[PDB]
Amino acid sequence: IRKKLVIVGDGACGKTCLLIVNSKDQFPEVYVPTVFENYVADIEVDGKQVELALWDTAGLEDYDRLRPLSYPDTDVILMCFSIDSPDSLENIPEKWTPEVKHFCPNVPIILVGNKKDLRNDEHTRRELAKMKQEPVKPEEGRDMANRIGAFGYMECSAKTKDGVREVFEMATRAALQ
Amino acid sequence: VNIKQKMQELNNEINMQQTVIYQASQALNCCVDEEHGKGSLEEAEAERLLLIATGKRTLLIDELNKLKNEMPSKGSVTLSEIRLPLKADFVCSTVQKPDAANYYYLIILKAGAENMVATPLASTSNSLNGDALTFTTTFTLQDVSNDFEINIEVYSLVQKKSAVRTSNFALVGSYTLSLSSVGNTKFVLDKVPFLSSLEGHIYLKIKCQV
Ligand SMILES: Nc1nc2c(ncn2[C@@H]2O[C@H](COP(=O)(O)OP(=O)(O)OP(=O)(O)O)[C@@H](O)[C@H]2O)c(=O)[nH]1
Ligand SMILES: [Mg+2]
């Protein structure tokens, strides 16, 4: 069983690290903004074996004109924001949802809060306090997930591996239905 | 003048450009048919990314190789209102036979790896004003003496309508602006290929200020 997964979200919100930790168990430490990049990973959920094609996309302006090349034949979308960036959560309904719904009309969406490990982070409170921001709360994520009609809501941390498998198991179940 | 640090930055940037070259190539390799991006705008944008990163990579490698093999009024230089005239018979062709192909152009401006800028894509189908392609770009070279040089390169792509690739954008003209250029607005391009659709000149404004 082959399914195509596409991941989208704001620049540097952790899309590639999530994909690489899932597929290779390695955490890429040095940031390299994505232009276009595909991976393959095998996974078994509910006793069913699936070959997941992982299509990675650019969040960054310089490179974001190709993004439509990744949308064809998609079975499931991972729509990402970072838990340390309410601005990135803000962008979900503004741009990401409309774009995805247009290019991927009836494809299920998993809303994913990345960088869970940064919710209790000295440094993040500081940056955000200056911005008046409060690190994203689970309820806020779930609420947006319900707002945008996502198949589900998940939180993870590529850095600690926490919640990663769960993200891709949910994505796969959505892709099977 | 801190050579280890400079070399590390050049090297990190070279690797970054190689990643862009690789990934833009992969994107182009997915354009197998119309549904999947063949002949599309996104294909042209990928060709453009590929061209830019290839050019930037080359400049960085040349700079790094230099590093490893070892009064005057200063101001800014500003270029604007770049326009590229095309031959009338070519323009007429785009009007009478508009489904024939998509013609894209772009201009690269450089004064070293640090200052390399590429315009957005321009097409004959909607950047053509009068007989000239219009580009929105403004390029600023700052704090430089009167020995400055800005290299202009004009590229064209015709879209008929590892795994690493060379961009289909072709070099169709070049010019080096210098102090003698300031205040002029019409420049005769070098290296225009035989039977090019280019009229032969590039138009722009070039200004110095302290
Ligand atoms: N602490 C922490 N940092 C992370 C985590 N995931 C990613 N990062 C860091 O955040 C930065 C962005 O990582 P990427 O995964 O490359 O982000 P991206 O969304 O793919 O970025 P673009 O390709 O430019 O759109 C990198 O420096 C990562 O090291 C995480 O789970 N925890
Ligand atoms: Mg990425």
Q: Given an 8 Å threshold on Cβ–Cβ distance, is B42 in contact with A69? A: yes
Determine phi and psi for A53, rounding to 5 degrees.
Answer: -80, 125
Is A54's C-beta closer than 6 angstroms to any atom of ligand 1?
no
**Is A36 close to B27, i.e. CB distance below 8 A?**
yes
Q: Inter-chain contact B27–A34, Cβ cutoff 8 Å?
A: no
Query: Could you give the 3-state DSSP secondary structure of residue A6?
Result: strand
Q: Which residues make Cβ contacts (< 8 Å) with residue A30, sequence separation at least 6? A: none
The secondary structure of residue A65, as a DSSP letter, is: T
Angle at B190 between CA B184 and CA B193, to 5 degrees: 135
The C-alpha of B171 sits at a distance from chain A's nearest C-alpha, in angstroms, of: 22
User: Among A6, A8, A31, which is best to mutate for testing ligand 1, by the most ligand atoms less than 8 A from CB?
Assistant: A31
For chain A, the straight-line distance linking the first and the last C-alpha, in angstroms and rounded, comes to 13
Report resolution in angstroms: 2.1
| Domain membership of residue A14 as a residue range | 1-177
Measured CA to CA, the distance from residue A79 to residue A112 in angstroms comes to: 6
Whether A110 contacts A154, CB under 8 Å: yes
Which residues of B are less than 8 Å from A38 in CB distance?
26
Q: Are residues B58 and B139 in the same domain?
A: no
With b meaning 16 or more CB within 10 Å and e meaning fewer, what string describes A149-168?
A: ebbbbbbbbbbeeebbeebb
CATH for A116 = 3.40.50.300
In this structure, the answer to whether residues B108 and B125 fall within a common structural domain is yes
Q: Which two tokens stand for residue A30?
A: 């040095």
E strands, chain B, in order = 75-85, 101-110, 116-118, 122-123, 128-129, 132-134, 139-144, 150-160, 170-177, 186-188, 201-209
Q: Which residue has the tokens 């990675």?
A: A56
- CA-based radius of gyration for chain A: 15
B87 with B44, same domain: the answer is no
User: Which bound ligand lies closest to the C-alpha atom of A18?
Assistant: 1
Do B47 and B135 fall into the same domain? no
Indicate if the alpha-carbon torsion angle A20, A21, A25, A29 is positive or negative: positive
CB B116 within 8 A of CB B108: yes
Query: Which residue range forms the structural domain that includes residue B207?
Result: 74-160+167-210
Calculate the alpha carbon distances from A59 to A14, A107, A175, B25 in Å.
Answer: 10, 20, 23, 18
* Cα–Cα dist A155/B53, whole Å: 35
Check residue A98 and give left, alpha or beta (phi > 0: left; psi -120 to 50: alpha): alpha
Query: Are B35 and B125 in a shared domain?
Result: no
Q: Where is the domain boundary, B73, B104, B136?
A: B73
**B108 CA to middle of ligand 2, Å?**
26
Answer yes or no: is the C-beta of A158 below 6 A from any ligand 1 atom: yes
Tokens of B163: 């795994």
Phi, psi of A118 (to 5 degrees): -95, 5
Residue B191 shares a structural domain with residue B88: yes
Q: Are residues B103 and B189 in the same domain?
A: yes
The number of folded domains in chain B is 2
Sign of CA dihedral A6, A12, A16, A22: negative
Token pair 């002949």 is found at: B39
Question: Inter-chain contact B20–A35, Cβ cutoff 8 Å?
Answer: yes
Identify whether residues B151 and B84 lie together within a single domain: yes
Looking at B43, B73, B103, the residue that finishes a domain is B73
Number of domains in chain A: 1
Question: Half-sphere exposure of B57 toward its Cβ, with a 13 Å CA cutoff?
Answer: 16
The answer to whether residues A53 and A2 touch, using CB atoms and an 8 Å cutoff, is: yes
The answer to whether the Cβ–Cβ distance between A35 and B27 falls below 8 Å is yes
What distance in Å separates the CA atoms of residue A169 and residue A45, rounded to the nearest whole number?
6
Q: Are residues B45 and B27 in the same domain?
A: yes
CB pairs under 8 A between A and B: 45
Task: Please tell me if the CB atom of residue A11 comes closer than 6 angstroms to any atom of ligand 1.
Answer: yes
CB B91 within 8 A of CB B128: yes
Q: How far apart are CA A161 and CA A158, in angstroms?
A: 5
**B64 and B49 within one domain:** yes
Instruction: Enumerate residues 6+ apart whose C-beta is below 8 A from B158.
Output: B101, B102, B103, B104
- On whether both B106 and B204 belong to a single domain, the answer is yes
Q: Which of A32, A66, A72 sits opposite B27 (nearest CB)?
A: A66
Whether B19 and B6 map to the same domain: the answer is yes
Name residue B45's amino acid: E
Q: Which residue has the tokens 């002029």?
A: B184
Look at residue B82 and give its three-state secondary structure: strand
The candidate with the shortest Cα–Cα distance to A32, out of B17, B49, B205, is: B17
Domain boundary, last residue among B55, B73, B91: B73
Question: What would the two tokens of residue B190 be?
Answer: 């070098």
In whole angstroms, give the CA distance from residue B120 to residue B159: 16
Chain B hits for A36, CB-CB cut-off 8 Å, are 23-24, 26-27, 30, 46
